[PDB]
Structures are given as structure tokens and as C-alpha cells.
Amino acid sequence: TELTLKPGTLTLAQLRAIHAAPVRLQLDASAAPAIDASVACVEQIIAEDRTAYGINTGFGLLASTRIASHDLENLQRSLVLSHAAGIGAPLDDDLVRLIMVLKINSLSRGFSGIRRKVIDALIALVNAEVYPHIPLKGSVGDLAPLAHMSLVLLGEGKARYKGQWLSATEALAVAGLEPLTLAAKEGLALLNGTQASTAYALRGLFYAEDLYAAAIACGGLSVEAVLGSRSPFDARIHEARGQRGQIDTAACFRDLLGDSSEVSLSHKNADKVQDPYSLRCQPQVMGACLTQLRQAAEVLGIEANAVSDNPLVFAAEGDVISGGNFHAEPVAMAADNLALAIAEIGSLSERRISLMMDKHMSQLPPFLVENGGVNSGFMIAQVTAAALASENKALSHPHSVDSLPTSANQEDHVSMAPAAGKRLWEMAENTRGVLAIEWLGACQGLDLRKGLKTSAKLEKARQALRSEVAHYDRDRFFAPDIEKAVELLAKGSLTGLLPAGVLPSL
Amino acid sequence: TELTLKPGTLTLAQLRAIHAAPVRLQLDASAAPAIDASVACVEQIIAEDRTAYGINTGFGLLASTRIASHDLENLQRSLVLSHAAGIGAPLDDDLVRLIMVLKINSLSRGFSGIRRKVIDALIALVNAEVYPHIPLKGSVGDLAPLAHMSLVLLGEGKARYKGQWLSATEALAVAGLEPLTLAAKEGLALLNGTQASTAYALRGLFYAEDLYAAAIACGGLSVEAVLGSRSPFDARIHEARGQRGQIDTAACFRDLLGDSSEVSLSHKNADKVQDPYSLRCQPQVMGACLTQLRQAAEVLGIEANAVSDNPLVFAAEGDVISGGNFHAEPVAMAADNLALAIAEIGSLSERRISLMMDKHMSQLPPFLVENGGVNSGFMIAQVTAAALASENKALSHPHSVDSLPTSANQEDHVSMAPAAGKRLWEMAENTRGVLAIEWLGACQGLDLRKGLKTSAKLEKARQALRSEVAHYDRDRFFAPDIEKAVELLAKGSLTGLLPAGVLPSL
Amino acid sequence: TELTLKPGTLTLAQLRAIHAAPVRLQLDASAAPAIDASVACVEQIIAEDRTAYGINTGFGLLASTRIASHDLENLQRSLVLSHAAGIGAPLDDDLVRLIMVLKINSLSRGFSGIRRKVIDALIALVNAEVYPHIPLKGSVGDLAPLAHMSLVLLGEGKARYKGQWLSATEALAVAGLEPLTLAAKEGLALLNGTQASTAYALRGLFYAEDLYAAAIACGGLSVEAVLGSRSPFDARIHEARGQRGQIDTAACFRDLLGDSSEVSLSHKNADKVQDPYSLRCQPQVMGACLTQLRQAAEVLGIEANAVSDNPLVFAAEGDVISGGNFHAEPVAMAADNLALAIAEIGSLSERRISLMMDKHMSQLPPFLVENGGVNSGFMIAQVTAAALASENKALSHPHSVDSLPTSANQEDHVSMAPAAGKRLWEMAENTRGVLAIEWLGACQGLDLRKGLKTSAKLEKARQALRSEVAHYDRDRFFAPDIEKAVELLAKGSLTGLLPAGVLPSL
Amino acid sequence: TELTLKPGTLTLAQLRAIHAAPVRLQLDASAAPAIDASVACVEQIIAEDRTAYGINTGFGLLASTRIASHDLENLQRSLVLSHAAGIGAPLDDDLVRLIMVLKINSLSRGFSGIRRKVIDALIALVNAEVYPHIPLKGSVGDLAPLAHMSLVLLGEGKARYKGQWLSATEALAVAGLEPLTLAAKEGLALLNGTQASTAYALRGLFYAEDLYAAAIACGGLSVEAVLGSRSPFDARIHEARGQRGQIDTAACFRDLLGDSSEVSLSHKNADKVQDPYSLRCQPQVMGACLTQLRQAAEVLGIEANAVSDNPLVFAAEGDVISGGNFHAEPVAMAADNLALAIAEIGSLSERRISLMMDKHMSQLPPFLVENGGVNSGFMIAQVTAAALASENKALSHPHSVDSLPTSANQEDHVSMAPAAGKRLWEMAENTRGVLAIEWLGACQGLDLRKGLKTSAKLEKARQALRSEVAHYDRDRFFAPDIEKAVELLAKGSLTGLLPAGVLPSL
């Protein structure tokens, strides 16, 4: 993607694209005025020998002590070095890229007092596909990960280029840069903010959306496999409840299923025995999940565009004000909200798998295999789905309700947004595995309705899976089939079946 | 309140009023057409000897077995009796009233096929202030509590009138009624639905709103008590982040605090040392809480108006359709969302109490008492606040992520909405106790700034507390002071200070 | 019970008896030496004008400031008054009695420096059945509840006698007492300690034990009702695993079931189809629960006898030492351990109920009723059991992992033991309701095996229930049957069937 | 380690050694009788044309259908292939080795009916250091991971040798083996069992023990750094409480600290101001943790030796019995117990870090650095410790309280032991990072007490860290210091300071 960025206007679709693939960006000309004007306000404070906390002061004893020039340049470097105190595995380059772009976006709104040259150095790194090392853990909601990113600007730390670690000076040279020296306010502008928290949660959102889309297709396949009814999806039921998420979800099921299929007609008014809730309550459960993800997306899409550093520079009035926008509470809650959605998408899918395995409910052979007292079929795949779904219950415990006071009680309440967002990634792996197993089971069950077809889009879902995984004719090593179905889901194989304009970023 | 109900149009303010106090209601004339038309559709199915699941069938063996008249009347009674299988403490009358009104509202939209006479019998009970016994527990999201309510219509169960338990026949007579006999579809119309789940969560919402309002006033008092700054509330900071909850929250703080007060001016540019986050990040944390409660309120206000029984009768087309609107998933998630807000309101307040107790941070005597090596002052009240805030972490664990399959796997996924909503009530007691202690502490600390006043609305908060609880001059039995402050908060003493149009139902 | 107490030697059976019913106690003569000797050590410090923290110092500025006599008497009173800062519902008298006896026991070990006269005043209150008001909440693990108890000794607060609240002076007079004045160290000896935390957790233990016992009988009934096998209980299986809890649990099942019964013989080698895990894995699951409760009981039985105040007086060496025995961490963990046991007893029972409702698994009519397309039978009782079991998952979240720093970070890590123990009470109500429903279902199912009997002890369980609740012949109001079964379980109706010497306190 | 295994007698020290490093094992001669005798019992059933579930039956339709020879060999292979349905990252070789040895141990007790040749093939793989691929996820407590392990015996799947993946036939050849054909009962003997669950939890135990040991040394360093007292560790305090974990923990602190040190003497009766609980309540909190880990270790050490497959063969009586020993409930609870210990070790350490950063409490410069309004020192390392400690609260939510019914409700209650154990690994990473930061901080703080030494063993802890990480003289890139301290802890640098015979496996 090639982006001429109007700061503060990134959409969720643009954020998904940044998360998914490399970007080339530059600032729109309209960004220059406010960026340069907050720098000029900082420069005027210094030229006028005024003292402003977080501009030309120290910290602590010196918090309203105007320290001298000399000390102030070095102070920026000391802040980045000492604050780069994170730990844990390195983030992958896609996430590092997203964090860098979010930081560029926020700074480029012109309230932070950082030189346009420093912003353009971050842009050069993005454009060169040079990604600073950022460790996963340490932020309480994002001094440490943002300090690690910023090290490379100073010629410290390391960065990844074409999958290999480079020294910061080699990495800068790849991007056409040499090490920079920071000025007043720039250490705080780079280190204070919510961009790591927000990126972690946005990744969770995009995963939740991918899983929602796949679950509409998988659930439609499972309805067909067990001769379920389309009547639960009737628009009038959903209008009468009035829940938007459910209305839009039922509309997606109707789009994928259509009014009837060869399978449904071949079993006619089938419906003589009411469907289980894991089928018939899909609009209600998946709709609640959709509302939850939309809740979270609204908060996260704002936060991606937020001015989140401190103190803020209001050049139009000539004011520098210390507030609290670095506190990532809304991000932490958005991530905890997303956990409910990822968990319940998986729970409902796991119950549909269980239904398909139950001969009294599925109208299929037990465990979806012919010769069933000699073959186990899908029996243990169903157990794997149970294990994955169960893990998500404990993982749903909220992080936004915890806090510890850091630094002699001044940092006396924090968000825990990073932990909240990061756990969504593993929840999403769990739900993706459940859905992969459901996909496998429903395609197997439809195969056993010999020669019959489902709807146009659900046949595309069958064809996608059968390109890699064969019908289960007799017991064979099961796990490679699950692995392949998971990889197809992770690559977005089913996402394009969902109607446009339903999910926040799609 | 006197209400001429247009079904499906209840507002959150009206729901708060129903929850708070008795009501007298009647249906608007415009409700009659659809109510009577879905009854006529049911009557036409029976007159035409057609068979329709959930109208004139049995269940199970007989699910598409048109059973005879005789059996069908008795079947309604057998359903109510057998389904009234709840357990636990009786609900209070305010909550029973809310459940009854929600059921009236939903049925009166005309999609359920229940006689207007049966709806008007529920209305007569409400109007007579006769409240069926409903036990707290048993629903998985609301057959059992709604069956208990419905017993009284049949002359079974018991009901409360002027605080005393009456037999159902005495209770009906108070309301001008005699026992009714139910018709086709009416047992399911009464028992299926989400009204208990929704009422439990609405009570949680109203509590969360009450606590939000009180926390703006308490936090403003604490800012003043410790000589905190107003600069964190500056509108430009909040506009620059762009989070609506935070913008509106900072506007509330500015309204209550004003630009300056005698206390703030008497300590002038005070601000020489940055405020702790529990003060300066109030817009960010309380704003995240406000967004969360607004999230939940949107879902709950829709659900209060929802058609939530099954099967639904679409008289305009002549269709009866079985779906899943009884599944309370969105309510369960809304309640889990509210838990985050109630917990974090309390956590932030508890940190402000801790700040006030800390002589290095408060600019007040340790533990808010004079003669402090002989007097303990607020030391153990602060511990009580810690205990209450801590309990809310475990209580925040979500219920919406659990389910058990009931009835031979047909009821194979449920919401757990009742448990999700009910736990909010105790969370709210915990946060109310924390805020009561904060109120006490900040008024004590302001008293120690001898003769100085805070802003107009915050002085009203001081006066409200000091009408019941004196300045703490020397150690005395502490707990009665906490009890009185809690009761004042529970009665809404501080709610009217908040600007109108901020909280969903206010 | 009449007890001549050798301090520090209370057994779990004695603690159960104290919890269950009134007591009359006196100290054994052998207690006097150490009690009076630690008082004499305190008196010698004061006579020698020495200074000892927590004996004759203030707190804070004065922590190693020997304050004068005068101030020291008043200081004790100020501590009790200011520390009585709890909130919430009053504890019931049984729990208050247990707390008082635990405090008597701990102080009477002679390490606390409190006059024997003050200990004997607490004993007089117990013996007179006069129970101070103690509010439920406020301790973080037990200054506030122990301060509330202690108020009555000073003629403050209130106390319950024959179910009515009395002023402290009337309450003291009932016990033959007049208000006391405390001496050096006595305020801390009364207020510091773990007795409320320990009592809350002991109540949880006793409930868990009661539920374990009832669950062996209910599970044996359910095995019989569905024609399950006795082979899973064979001692050789359990010896081969080697887990003690499971060995002892299987021995209990064999004792209650016997080698065969009329029902089992009438269905002979029945066993042709393997039993579900909720039957066949009872030794494994219930055994894990038994080990967990034994874990907790070992810790709690020690803590009931612990010296838990501070500073401690070692009269034999002449030393007063400040440590940390008031920290209730081990109690908090014991309570969290008990939560796992209470939850899993309930989960396994709920699955046995579900099995009995499933015609494909139970060999009984669906929902345990004859005429089943017209009668719903136990269908909604099973839903109530699901709701109760589900609630226990969230309630199992541990409290021992939380802490907040109280009082300017000196009280910088606390246990949250009170919250951990108290939540067990509601978990136990939930599991008791599940077991009540299982009891009802299995007796109903056995009735449907017309004229057949189970084993001697399981017939006693049937007779106990059928004395209050009839066979379910046709749909009727269900809930009163659940209520009666719960009350029978709460009264210990099934406990006496379990072999002696299995459960810690039984 | 070279082991002549007496089955069923492995100690926790031996299990630690197996987990830590390669092993060479053979069975003791005394193992042969029972192994061969249960095979002969299986052979006698087949020779006698008897039918025995799980020996010579099918499953399902055929569960008491004696299927023919032919089908029975192939049935073993079909079970392994179809059951190898796990997903997720491959286990590391140390854990695979532990699982293999636990399976060898359990089978070699002679109750499973599997040929000694098959056991010796697993032994050959261990001895050759050839480790089957086992994916992390899928078991609900261990068909799938044990099926994956077993694939390699049949010449399927893959195995790791010298860090590289080999085909199963190459891997077998490395071990001197060719593919095997399984006999009656052998597929179930290999696949049923608790060895993966038990290995996952044992790894958690060993980590918890390593962290306990490191935390005694780190906490002793922190006591010294802030001039804390040794009086809290006095044996008489701990004897008077009577909790064993606390007694043994205080004895460990006394051993490492000694009666006095140069630092403690140089500050003399220092003690004039009481230490915070994070120091003075170390015996109480760490002792509760020790009891918890000992609880868990007792259960896990039994389970490592358990006969956990099914059905079991009792050759002495000639009986084959189906029970439930594959249900890993006790392991799941042991793992949840360990979570409390790992969490609270980390919480207490994080509070000691916070104490060291607080100039009002530490008697050290703020943030442990000289020149502190220009240098940030340990400020953000402390934030990293807060983040890690906080994550452990949510991760402590129990898995043993969840279950889903798998396979048409026969598998109707499961343990979730694998998830319970696996999450301990990440909890341990979190607590290890906290302790690494504490180690760094306390060594820095002691350095600032110029030229003074602590005790003999605590100086060894200082020397170990200072071999890799220098004194923090001025701000520098912080994170590499944390990384090095974590690696030293992970390698057991501090474990050998703890007295022997305290921790279960040490």
C-alpha cells in the first residue's frame, strides 16, 4: 500500500492493510503546519528562558528546574536508553510496522513538539522495511517497547531487515539515515503513548474479525451437513429482537446459505425436529459477538488516531499542558471485550462439532466415518476442539481490572492494556483450531450426503478445503489435516465469502 | 409514574423510573391491533386443523403431533408448574416489577400470540403493587423465574403485597383478578424470553451509572483536598485523544470543579509537582468506564424492548417461525462489560483514598487526623476500601464465556446472562463502599484546610455528608460513619450534581 | 459441648462442633503459667522503663517513643474504636462464636502478653451466648472484624443475645461482666490475628466436607438409577494409581453400594455398555476433591491453633519480637484450594443429572417422568443445576493472588484471605442445590424400577428424601421439592452414611 | 543419568534429573514377572475365545463384540493414527523425554498387558536420544500427545535427533529398531494415560521450586539492601504459628542471612522503624507458597508412578477391569495449586522491588541511581516487573473447574489438566523476570553501601550476577542486563544456595 497520510484519519481498513503487508508512506502537505508550529512553540519557550515541565525541565528534584541545554540533549538519550527495559520474545515485523505507523500518525497531528525530521526518520524506516527490535513484555499501558523502537533512531539497539538482525547503524544506512540526536520534548514524545497497546489490541480485532467471517461459513456448512433449517435466519425474527449485531449476522447467514440448496431440498421440509441452539441461535450468539467486536473497534479506531503522548503542546494558544492521555484504560477494556467475542465464537463452533459427532442429532454416521466400530473417525479431533475451546475460558479473565502502583506511588494506576491485547492472539489460535475442525467435519459430513451440493458460496468453502485435505475414507494420521485447515483459515481463505461492510475493517 | 405504553418504545430513563418506584400503566390504543392479530393467527391455525410447533403441538415425541384441545389447555398449566423450578432468595419487589413490565412490553408488541386479557392481567398486578415471588437462581438465559411469575396468574405460587406474602388467590383478588386458564402458545409466550436476564443487567447498569456520578463528585473533592490541578481536565487534551467517553467525563469534571476555587487559588499555581495518575488520569479511566457502560446500555435498552419468546407469530404473512431470540448472549456480554466499569471506578477511587492517606503525597496529616501517633484516623477505613476493591477483581471474571448443554443436548449452548447480571449488584456494593470512604476522606481533608471552600457543586457534596457525619476530630468508632455515607450514596445524594445527558438513563 | 481448653490443641472435630452449636468452655489449669508469664514480661518492661515497639510505644512518629501511662491506656481504646471500620452484613452467631473461640485459643497459648482476665471475659461472652456484632467485610487478612468483636469488651458496639441486639453494656451484664479497660499490648493482641480469615475458611471446609459426603450417597444412587457398574470402584484399580484421596473415596463408594443390590442383580452383568465418566471416574474426580480438602484442612487446623498476633512475647528469654504472623496468606490459599473442590463436586453431580435426563444413556424415560410429551418432568430442574454449577467457575477465581498496598506502603502485601473464604459459602450453596437435584432425580429414577431396592445405606438416603418429597407422578410445582431437598442436605441428612475417619473433621 | 528402573519407584529428584538432561535406562529384572504375566493373561483370554472389553473387542456397536485377529492388529494401528489429532507447537525434547519415561514407568508396573518388547522399544528411543514429535495442544486430560509419541513405534510421524527432524523409519534405525506391529490392548495401553498432563505439571513444579530457591536469595539481598531486620526470621515466631512451610522457609532465610553481616552491623540496631510486609512477612507468604508446592508435588510424584491406562489387567486374579484412572483431575488441581505459588512468589518480589525504588522506604537514592534528576535508573525496570507480576493474576484462573462433554456424552467429564500445567510455564517466565529485576536492584543497592558485605551465601549471589552485569553507574541500555539476569536464573545460578531437603525434588 502507498499512503499519503493525513494524520489522524487512518481507517480500520487501512490499519488492517498496514498490519497485513509492507507500506510506503509520506505525510500529506497539510500535516506540516501543525507539526512545525508545535516545534516552534517549544523553541520559543527555550528562547524566552521560560520553564515548562516535560519541555526543558528535569524530572524529580528538577521537575520545575530549567536545566541547561547540554544536559537537555543528553537527557533525551538517557531517557531512551534507560526506558528500553522490556523483556520477552521479539515482536514480528508486521506488528513492529503497525506500531511505527501508529506513532508516526499520532506525532504527525502536531500536538507533540517533535521535529518533522524525526517523524520522517521513522517514515524512512517503514519505507525501507527496517523494523526495530521490540520485545513483547514490559509495558503496563508503552514506555519500554516505544523506547526499544526509538533506540534505532539514536544508532542503538538492533533492527530486522529481510528477516535478519542488523546493528542499528547498518539498519539506519539501509534506510538512508544516520543516527539522530534528540531535542527538548522529543524523548517523551517518542516514549509516551499507547501505540504498542493499541497495536496489540488491533491485531486481536483483526483476528476476531477473520474468525467471525470463517465461523459464518463453517456454521452454514454445519447447518447443511446435519439437515438443519433456514427458518432461524428469517429476517423478521431478528428485526423483532432489534439487536443490530444479530440482524447483520442473520443477513450474512442468508447470503451464504440462500433460500434453499440441493441438500436442503433433497430433505424437503426436513425441519419436522427443531434444531439445536448451536445452529438455531447462531444469529443471537454470533450477533452478540459482532456487537462486541464493533464496540472494541470503535474505541481502537479512535485510539489509532489519538494524540497519546504528554505533555501536549497547543501552539495556537501558546500553552503546554500535562494530562494523562498515555493511560491506555480504554484499550485494555476494548481488548477484554474482544476476548468475550473470540471465546464465544469458539464455544459455539465446538458445540456444532459435538452435534456433528452425535449420531442421534446429526443424521450422519457416528464420528463422521464409515465402518465405525473399527474406525474412530473424527472422535479425537473433537476432543482437540474441546481442549482449545476450554482454554479460552480462563484466558478470558480480564486484565483491565488489575493495576500495581509503580514509581513511588506517582504512577499509581495503570491499564494493563498490553497484556489484555496480547492474550487475544492465543485465544484466536484456539478458536481458529476449533473452526478448522468444524470446517473439516462439515465438509466430511456433506460428502456423506452423496453427490449433493450446498449453496454457491458454501461450495466454494468445500472446494477450498478439498484442494488440500481429502475426504476421510478410513482412519489415517489425523493431525496433518487439522494443520492444513488451520493454515487455510490463517491465510484468509474464507474471509472473502462474507458480504462487505459488515465487519469494522472489512 | 403513570405510563400509557407504546410497546417497544421504553427508554432507559423510563426503565430507571420503573426500577426505582411503583408504576401505573395501561397499553396505548395503538397496541391492540398487533396483539389481537397474532391471537387471531393462532386461532386460525387451530380452526383450520393445521399443525404448528409451539402452537398446538406437544414437545418431544409429539413435537409435530397436533394434540387435542383438552390436552392443550392442560399442557399450558403443566409447563408453568414444572418450569417453576428456581431456587434461592426471593427477588425484591422493585426487580419483580421491572421483570413484569419488561414482559408486558415484549408481549404487547404483538408477535407472541397471547391474548390481550392475559397481558392486562399482568398489568393489573403491576398497578395493584402485587409482586409474584420469583427466586433469584436457576435461569441460564429465563424459563424458571418467568414460570414463577406466571404461577400467580393461574392462582398458584405466592405474591407480595405491602411487604407481606399472600396466597396467589388473595393476591389476584387484591388486583381485581381471578385465576386464569391459558390457551395455545401462552405458556411459551410467558416462559420463554430474556426479561429476567435483562432486568438483572439493567439493575447493574443503573448502579454503575449511580456510581459513575458519585465518583465524579468524590474525585473532584479528592483533587481539591490534596491541592491537585485542574489542567488535566482541559478540553483540548481530551479532544486531541478523541475518545468520547473521556471527552464527556472531562466536561463533567470541569462543570463540577469550575476554573478555580478558594482552595485552589489559596495554593495558587500549586501545580509545581505533577499529580498522580489517580487524579490526572481520571478523564481517561473514568471515560473508558463511561464508554463501557454506554456500550452495555445500548444493548440492554434494545433488549428491554425486544420480542424474545418463541415461536414468533407473523400475522401479516400468516407464518409461525421458530428461532432463537430467547438466547440472552448479548445481555450476558453487556453485564460482563459493566463489571469492568464497576471494578475500575472502584479501583481508581481506592487509589485516591490511598493518596490522601500518604503524607508525602497528600499535603495533609498522615491518615487525615490531627495528633497522629496517638490517633489512627482513617488508617483502617483505607484497608476496608482495599478489601472491597480487591473483591471486584475476581468478581469481574466473565460468565458469558461459560455454557453447559441442558436437555439431551438440544439446549446445547446457553448464555449464563442471569449470573452475569446478578454479580454486578455485589460489585456495586463494593464500589459504593469504596466511594463512601473516599467521600469521607476528602471532606475530612478539605476540613483540615481551615475555612476554605471548594466549588459550588463540591460544597453541596460536603454539606450533604456533613449533615450526617461530623469532622473526625479524634479517634472514635469508625464504622457508623461509613454506613451513613454508603446509605447517602445508595439514596442518590450525589447523582443530581452531574450534568444531565451524560449517562444513558439520566 | 463442654470444653476444658488446652490452648493450641483444638481438633477439626472440635472446631466443627463449635461452629455447629453453642459451647461452654474454661481454660485448663495448664494454660495459666504461660498466659501470666507473658503479662509479667510486659509488666517488667514497663516497670524497668524500657521501650518496646507494640508494648509501650506509640505508632509512627512515636514508634520507638516510650509514651506515658495515661496515653497508653487511652491508646488501647483509640485503637479498638478507630479499627472497627468494617462494613456489610452482620455475621451470624455461629461464626461469631467460632471467631471468639479461635481468639481465646490463640491468646491462651501465652505469647501475647494479654491479661488472663481479658481472655476470661471473652470466655464469659461465649458461655453466656452473647455474640458481638461483626460486619462481614473490611479485612484484607483481621483488624476490623476483631476490633468490632472487641468493642463489646469496652462497653461499645452491640451484641446479639437470643436473636436480639443488645447494647454492649446490657450484653456484658448478661454475661456477668462490666466494661473493661485495656492495658499495654492488649489492643494489638485482640486486633492483630487471623481468626476471622480462619473462621471463614473453616466454614468453607465444613461445607465442602458435608457436600463431599452427600455426593458419595447421591452418586451411588445415580449409579443404581441408570444401571451402572460397581467394577469402577474395585480397590485394585485405585491401589494401582496410588492416589490416597481416590483410594479412600472408592472405599466409601464400596461401603455405600456393597458388592451388589436387588437393582444391580435384577439387571445382572448389566455392564455390556461402559459407564460414562461422571459415574466411572467418580473415584478419580471425587478423590482429587478429597485430597484438596485435606490439603486445606491441614493448613486450617494448624491456623486455628496459631499464635497470630504481633509483637510476640517470649517470656522464657525476656524478648519481644515483631514479625508477621498476622499475614493470612496460607489461609487465603487454603480457601482458594477449597473452591476447586466445591466446584468440581458440583460439576460432576451436574453431569450425573444430565445423564439421568438423557434417554439414550439412562435406560429411564426422558426427563424421569411418565407421559413425556405432555409432561416436562425434571427438564427445568436440570437447567437449575446447570446454572448453579456454572456460577462456580467464575467464583473459583483465586483471591490469594491479589493484593493492594495499604498505609503509605508499609502494609505493602496482604492476603485477601477473608474474601477467599467467604466466597466458599455461596459456592457451597450452589453445589448443595446441584446435589439436591441429583438426589431428587436418582430417587425418582429408582422409583421407576418398580419395587426394586438399592443397598442398605442408599435405601436410607431414599427414605430420608421420601419422608418430605413424593414421587413425581405428573407435572406439579417443582421448586418446593428442591427447597426441601436442599434443607435436608443443609441439616446433614446424608452425612452419617459416610464411613468415619475419611473427612478431616468427621 | 544411568537408571536401572524399578517401576513405580521414581522419586521427584529422579524426575527432575530426567527433565533436565538425557538418560540411559533399562528395566530392573524384578519388573519382568508382572509385565509378562499381564501379557499372558491377555493371551489366555484370546486363546480361550473369551471376550473382554478393551482387549479383543471393537468399540461402539462392537464393544462386547469379539472381533477377529486380523481386524484386531489393524485396529491398534487405526487407533494410533486417528488419535494423533493434536495441534500446536512441538514440545521440546526434554519434555518429550519425560513423557516417554513416565509412560515406560507406568506400563512397566505390569497392569497394562503390553509386551515387554514394546516397552523396550520406548526405552531404546530414550537411550538413543530420539524424541518423537508431540504437539502441545489437544488433550483434555492424554490420547492425542501419546498417540503422536506412539506413531514413531509404528514407523509413522517424525522424531528429533540431534536437533533435526527425521522420518520415523530413520529415527527408529538410529535407535536400532524397525517398525513394530501392535497386539491386543497395546493401542489403549499406549494412548490412555496421564503422562503428558503429569509431565506438563512436573515442569511447572520444577520451575516453581527453582523460583522459590531464587526468591529466598533475592529477598535476603533486598532485606540487606534496605537495612532490614533479621528479627522477623526468628525461629520462635514461626514455631508459635506452627505452619511447616513457614518454619522451613524462615530456617532457609536464617541460613542464607546468618545472625548478622557487615552491612547489618554497620547500621546496628537499625531496626528503630518496622520493616514493610514484603520483607517481614516473607516467611508467612513464601511459607504458604512452599506448602502449596509441596501439596502439588505429593500428588504429582504419585501420579508419575501411577498405572493410568485402561482397562487394567489383574493377572493374579485373572480379571480385566474397566475403570477411570486416565482421568487427570488430581493433576489439574495440582497444577492450579502451583499457579497460586508461582503468582505469589512473583507478587512479593515485585513489592520488594517497589520498596527498593522508594526513597522514603529504601534508605537508598531514588530509583537506585546516583544523579537522579538526570538519570532514571531502575524506574522502568520496576514497571517491567509490575507488568510481569500482573499478568500472573489472570493466568492463575483455574482450568480444573472447566469441562466439556466429548463423544456423544460418554466422555462427559474431563480434567483440563494439560492446559492447567502448560500455563505454569509462562507464569514461571513472568516470576523469573520479576526475580531477575529484584536481583539486579538489590545488588545495585548493596553496591551503594560502599564497600560493605552481606553474608557468605548472599555475597555468592552478588558475585554470580556481577560476573555478567556491571554496577549501574549512569543511564545505559537497560534490557540486556535483565536478559542476562534471567538467563542466570534459568540456569539455576542461585538454586545451590538453598539448604538441601527443603524443596520436594531438591
Swiss-Prot record, chains A, B, C, D:
EC assignment: 4.3.1.3
Post-translational modification, as annotated: Contains an active site 4-methylidene-imidazol-5-one (MIO), which is formed autocatalytically by cyclization and dehydration of residues Ala-Ser-Gly.
List the Gene Ontology MF annotations in alphabetical order.
Answer: histidine ammonia-lyase activity
Q: Which UniProt keywords apply?
A: Cytoplasm, Histidine metabolism, Lyase
Pathway per the UniProt entry: Amino-acid degradation; L-histidine degradation into L-glutamate; N-formimidoyl-L-glutamate from L-histidine: step 1/3
Q: Which Pfam families match?
A: Lyase_aromatic (PF00221)
Q: Which GO terms describe its biological process?
A: L-histidine catabolic process to glutamate and formamide; L-histidine catabolic process to glutamate and formate
State if Lyase is listed as a keyword. Answer: yes
Q: What induces it?
A: By histidine and urocanate.
Give compartment(s).
Answer: Cytoplasm
Statement: the UniProt record of this protein carries the keyword Cytoplasm = yes
> Quick one: where is this thing mainly located?
cytoplasm
Which leading EC class covers this enzyme?
A: lyase
Family named by the database record: Belongs to the PAL/histidase family.
- HAMAP family the UniProt entry points to: His_ammonia_lyase
**Assembly and partners?**
Homotetramer.
* Name of the molecule in the record: Histidine ammonia-lyase
Q: Which gene encodes it?
A: hutH
